[PDB]
Design a binder for this molecule. Structure first.
Ligand SMILES: [Mg+2]
Ligand SMILES: [Mg+2]
Ligand SMILES: [Mg+2]
Ligand SMILES: [Mg+2]
Ligand SMILES: [Mg+2]
Ligand SMILES: [Mg+2]
Ligand SMILES: [Mg+2]
Ligand SMILES: [Mg+2]
Ligand SMILES: [Mg+2]
Ligand SMILES: [Mg+2]
Ligand SMILES: [Mg+2]
Ligand SMILES: [Mg+2]
Ligand SMILES: [Mg+2]
Ligand SMILES: [Mg+2]
Ligand SMILES: [Mg+2]
Ligand SMILES: [Mg+2]
Ligand SMILES: [Mg+2]
Ligand SMILES: [Mg+2]
Ligand SMILES: [Mg+2]
Ligand SMILES: [Mg+2]
Ligand SMILES: [Mg+2]
Ligand SMILES: [Mg+2]
Ligand SMILES: [Mg+2]
Ligand SMILES: [Mg+2]
Ligand SMILES: [Mg+2]
Ligand SMILES: [Mg+2]
Ligand SMILES: [Mg+2]
Ligand SMILES: [Mg+2]
Ligand SMILES: [Mg+2]
Ligand SMILES: [Mg+2]
Ligand SMILES: [Mg+2]
Ligand SMILES: [Mg+2]
Ligand SMILES: [Zn+2]
Lengths: 86, 49, 99, 136, 97, 123
RNA sequence: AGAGUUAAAUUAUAACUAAGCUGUAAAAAGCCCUAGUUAAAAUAAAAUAACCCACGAAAGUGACUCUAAUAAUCCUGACACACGAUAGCUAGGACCCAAACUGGGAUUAGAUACCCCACUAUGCCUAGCCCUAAACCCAAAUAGUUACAUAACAAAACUA
C-alpha cells in the first residue's frame, strides 16, 4: 500500500495470449507458496494444529526426497537384462 | 597495536570545527556500499562511471 | 616369498588412489544391443552405451577408454542398516582403445 | 530479450499501446470471491468507466458463484467500457476464487484488449486473525 | 619388523570442503543489491537454503540483514527493486518454462 | 567504530541539508559522542513512501554517522532525533565492524541418520 | 526484562461509481449508514526466511532497534525457596479482528448441535491474584558401556 503499484506480482502478456500469461503468474505464486497461504488463511488454524501440519509435511518431504533419490539411483538397472533365462 | 590504530584515527576524527569542512565534503562526494556477487564467489562492484 | 602387504602396496589399484576422474583402460566382455558391459578390471564391471561414432566398431572382445567416476555405486537410504549396492561401477566412455 | 514483464515507472521504457504510456492504460479490477465476482474498469485517472457484478448480470445466490457467471459479467463489463472507448486494459485480480480466470477471459472474449495481469491479493503478514475453521 | 605394512597417517587425498557462495564474505544490510540477489523478484519473498544454497550461518545472516534493510527502508518489501532485476542471478529457481 | 546512525532525511536543497546534518552532529557531540565519519549515500526515491511529522514523503536523502557513545546515552539521542522536524526516519545500530568474521570453514556435510528404528525382521 | 520503532493486511472517515452485498451442499435470515475504487491514524497480530533446530530450569520463545542479561571449577537432594501454558478472578485503561454466552436463519422427528448471521464476557496493556494441562518426548537426575540380550508393541539392551 505504501509501495509503488504494478511492480509486484505482475506479468505482461506477450503476443496477446492471455491464458498463457495467466498460467505464468499462477506458476509464480504457487512456486513461492502464496496460493497455499491464501488457501491456508481463509480460516484460522490454531498453533498446535499448525505444528502438526508442519511436522507431517516435513516428514513426508523427507520420505519423498529419499524415495526419489533411491528411484533415480536404481534407474540404471532398469536397462534390459543381459543374463536372461540362464 | 590497537591503541596506536586509534591514535592514528584521532587525527581523522570529526571535531567541532571540522563540521564546516566535513559536512561540505560529505555532500560533495557521495559514496556507495552497493555491492554484488557472482556464482563463482567473485564480486562485481558497480560499473565504472 | 612376497608378503601380501607388499603385493598390495605395489599394485596398480592402489597406485591409482582416489577413483574420481581417473583415466582407465577396459575391455568389453558382453553385449546387449545398446549396452556394452565393461570390465576395466576393478571389482565390478561398469555399463556403457554404444556411441554414435562408429557404432559397429565396439564388439565383444574390443578394448576401450574409460573415465572412471566411481569404483562402485552405493548409498545408504532411509531406515537402512547397510547401504545398497548396484553391483556396478560408474564410468564414462571416451574413445575405443585409442592405439 | 523480448517481453520483460514489469515495465519500470522511469521513462527509460518506450512502449506504447494506442500511443499511451503504460501508466495511462486503464486498470480493470477483478474481485473473485467464493460467492461472487465483480469487475470495475477504471481510468488511469481513477474515474470508473465500467462495473459488472455476477449479480448485476442477473444470476442469483448460488449460481452467481460459477465461472460461467464470471465470463458473463466480464463480457458486459467490457461492453460498458468499450462504449466509453477503452482499447487496452491492465488487469488486477483480487482474491482467489472461482471466477478469476473466467472473468479475465471474459474481458478478452468480450472484446477488450489485455496487456497485463498483476495479482494483488491481500496477504496478511499476520495482521487480523481470520474467523474460526469449520466443522468443530 | 614388517616395513611394508600400512602407515597410520591422515587422509592425503581428502577433498577440500565446499563453500557457500558467501563463505568469509561480509553481509551488510547496506548493500541492497546483494540482498536483492536472494529475494524473489515478484513476491519479495526470501528464498530458502534449498534455493539460495548457503551455509547455515550465511543464510541466517542474509535473512536478518534483509529484515533490517526493510524496516530501515533501504529496500522494499513486496517486490525486488527494478534497478536490480537485470543483475546477475544466483539462485536455482526456474519460473518461466 | 562503535555505533552507526542511519539518517533518512527530508530531501531539501543544499543549505537546509547542511543545517540539518550540522545540528544533528551537534546534538550528538552534546550527549557525549565522538563522531568518526559522515557518509552521504545520495538522494534516493525511498523504497516505499514514509509518513512522519504529518508529511508523506516519496524521496529522501541518506546518511551514515559512525560514532562512539556511552551506553546510557543512546536513548537520549534517539529521543532528540524523533523530536526533530526534518528527520524522515532515524536509527542507531551497533556498527557492523564490531561483529567478528568467524571463518566458514565450509559446509560440514551431514550424513544420513542411522539407528533410529530398531532392527526388526518384520514382513 | 525494559525503552523506542513499523512492512503487509484491516477499520474509522471522506471523494467518486453501481445497485445490490454477504452467505452456504442448497438456502434463508442479515445488511443496503451496502459494495468496488482512491485516499488514510489508532488498536491488534507478527507471510516468506524455517527443507533451520538455536535460546531458556520448565512453562515458553522466531517483525525491528538499543539497554540490561543468561547460577554454579559443574554429584544426588525436599512437604523449604523462586517460577509455572491456556482459561479464570480483582481494579483501571484498550477494542481492528476473533469469539464462549445469547438472539435471529436454516437443517432436523426433535437440533438447546454440526452450517449461516449478528453481538458479549474474553483474548490486548498496567498492577495484583489463581497454580491447574494428554504441564507427555507418557521415557527422573549424574557418570558410563554396546558387553549379556529379542514377552508383545513403541523410541534397541544395560550397569553404578
Ligand atoms: Mg488502499
Ligand atoms: Mg512451508
Ligand atoms: Mg506465522
Ligand atoms: Mg473438540
Ligand atoms: Mg521396524
Ligand atoms: Mg512492560
Ligand atoms: Mg498500514
Ligand atoms: Mg481499505
Ligand atoms: Mg475501509
Ligand atoms: Mg459454497
Ligand atoms: Mg433476504
Ligand atoms: Mg513455515
Ligand atoms: Mg521448532
Ligand atoms: Mg548456566
Ligand atoms: Mg542439585
Ligand atoms: Mg498461570
Ligand atoms: Mg488471562
Ligand atoms: Mg470486547
Ligand atoms: Mg476505535
Ligand atoms: Mg465481529
Ligand atoms: Mg438458535
Ligand atoms: Mg434425523
Ligand atoms: Mg456435518
Ligand atoms: Mg463488534
Ligand atoms: Mg498473553
Ligand atoms: Mg507442552
Ligand atoms: Mg504428547
Ligand atoms: Mg506424569
Ligand atoms: Mg530428581
Ligand atoms: Mg543440574
Ligand atoms: Mg556394559
Ligand atoms: Mg510374538
Ligand atoms: Zn559458508
Amino acid at each position: 500500500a505504501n509501495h509503488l503499484k504494478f511492480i509486484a506480482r505482475t506479468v505482461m502478456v506477450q503476443e496477446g495470449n492471455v491464458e498463457g500469461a495467466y498460467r505464468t503468474l499462477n506458476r509464480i505464486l504457487t512456486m513461492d507458496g502464496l496460493i497455499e497461504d491464501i488457501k491456508r488463511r481463509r480460516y484460522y488454524e490454531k498453533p498446535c494444529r499448525r505444528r502438526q501440519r508442519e511436522s507431517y509435511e516435513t516428514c513426508r518431504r523427507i520420505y519423498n526426497m529419499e524415495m526419489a533419490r533411491k528411484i533415480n539411483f536404481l534407474m540404471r538397472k532398469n536397462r534390459a537384462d543381459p543374463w536372461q533365462g540362464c | 597495536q590497537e591503541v596506536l590504530q586509534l591514535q592514528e584515527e584521532a587525527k581523522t576524527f570529526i571535531t567541532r570545527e571540522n563540521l564546516e569542512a566535513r559536512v561540505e565534503e560529505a555532500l560533495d562526494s557521495p559514496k556507495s556500499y552497493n555491492w554484488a556477487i557472482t556464482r563463482e564467489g567473485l564480486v562485481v562492484r558497480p560499473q565504472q562511471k | 616369498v612376497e608378503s601380501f602387504a607388499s603385493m598390495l602396496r605395489h599394485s596398480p589399484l592402489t597406485q591409482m588412489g582416489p577413483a574420481k576422474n581417473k583415466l582407465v583402460i577396459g575391455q568389453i566382455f558382453h553385449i546387449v544391443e545398446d549396452d556394452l558391459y565393461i570390465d576395466f578390471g576393478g571389482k565390478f564391471h561398469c555399463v556403457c552405451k554404444r556411441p554414435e561414432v562408429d557404432g559397429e566398431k565396439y564388439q565383444k572382445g574390443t578394448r576401450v577408454r574409460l573415465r572412471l567416476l566411481d569404483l562402485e555405486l552405493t548409498s545408504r537410504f532411509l531406515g537402512a542398516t547397510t547401504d545398497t549396492t548396484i553391483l556396478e561401477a560408474d564410468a564414462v566412455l571416451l574413445g575405443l582403445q585409442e592405439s | 530479450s523480448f517481453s520483460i514483464y514489469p515495465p519500470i515507472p522511469g521513462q527509460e521504457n518506450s512502449l506504447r499501446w494506442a500511443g499511451k504510456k503504460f501508466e495511462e492504460i486503464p486498470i480493470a479490477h477483478i474481485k473473485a470471491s467464493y460467492n461472487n465476482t465483480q469487475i470495475q474498469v477504471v481510468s488511469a485517472a481513477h474515474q470508473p468507466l465500467a462495473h459488472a457484478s455476477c449479480g448485476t448480470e442477473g444470476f442469483r445466490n448460488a449460481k452467481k458463484g460459477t465461472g460461467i457467471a464470471a465470463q458473463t459479467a466480464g463480457i458486459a463489463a467490457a461492453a460498458k467500457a468499450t462504449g466509453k472507448g477503452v482499447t487496452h486494459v491492465r488487469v488486477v485480480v483480487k482474491g482467489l476464487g472461482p471466477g478469476r480466470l473466467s472473468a479475465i477471459k471474459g474481458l478478452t472474449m468480450g472484446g477488450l484488449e489485455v496487456i497485463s495481469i498483476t495479482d494483488n491479493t491481500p496477504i496478511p503478514h499476520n495482521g487480523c486473525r481470520p474467523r474460526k475453521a469449520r466443522r468443530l | 619388523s614388517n616395513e611394508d605394512l600400512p602407515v597410520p597417517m591422515e587422509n592425503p587425498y581428502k577433498e577440500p570442503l565446499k563453500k557457500c557462495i558467501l563463505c568469509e564474505k561480509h553481509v551488510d544490510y547496506k548493500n541492497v543489491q546483494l540482498l536483492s540477489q536472494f529475494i524473489s523478484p515478484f513476491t519479495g519473498c526470501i528464498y530458502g537454503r534449498h534455493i539460495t544454497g548457503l551455509c547455515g550461518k550465511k543464510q541466517k545472516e542474509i535473512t536478518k540483514a534483509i529484515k533490517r534493510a526493510q524496516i530501515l527502508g533501504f529496500m522494499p518489501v513486496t517486490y525486488k527493486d527494478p534497478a536490480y532485476l537485470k543483475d546477475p542471478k544466483v539462485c536455482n529457481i526456474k519460473y518461466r518454462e | 567504530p562503535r555505533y552507526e546512525l542511519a539518517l533518512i532525511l527530508k530531501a531539501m536543497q543544499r543549505p537546509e541539508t547542511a543545517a540539518a546534518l550540522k545540528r544533528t552532529l551537534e546534538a550528538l557531540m552534546d550527549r557525549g559522542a565522538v563522531v568518526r565519519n559522515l557518509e552521504n549515500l545520495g538522494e534516493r526515491m525511498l523504497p516505499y513512501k514514509i509518513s512522519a511529522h504529518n508529511q508523506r514523503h516519496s524521496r529522501g536523502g541518506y546518511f551514515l554517522v559512525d560514532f562512539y557513545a556511552p551506553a546510557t546515552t543512546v536513548e537520549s539521542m534517539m529521543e532528540h532525533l524523533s523530536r526533530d522536524i526534518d528527520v524522515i526516519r532515524p536509527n542507531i545500530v551497533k556498527h557492523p565492524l564490531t561483529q567478528e568474521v568467524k571463518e566458514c570453514e565450509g559446509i560440514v556435510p551431514v550424513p544420513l541418520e542411522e539407528k533410529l528404528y530398531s532392527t526388526k525382521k518384520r514382513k
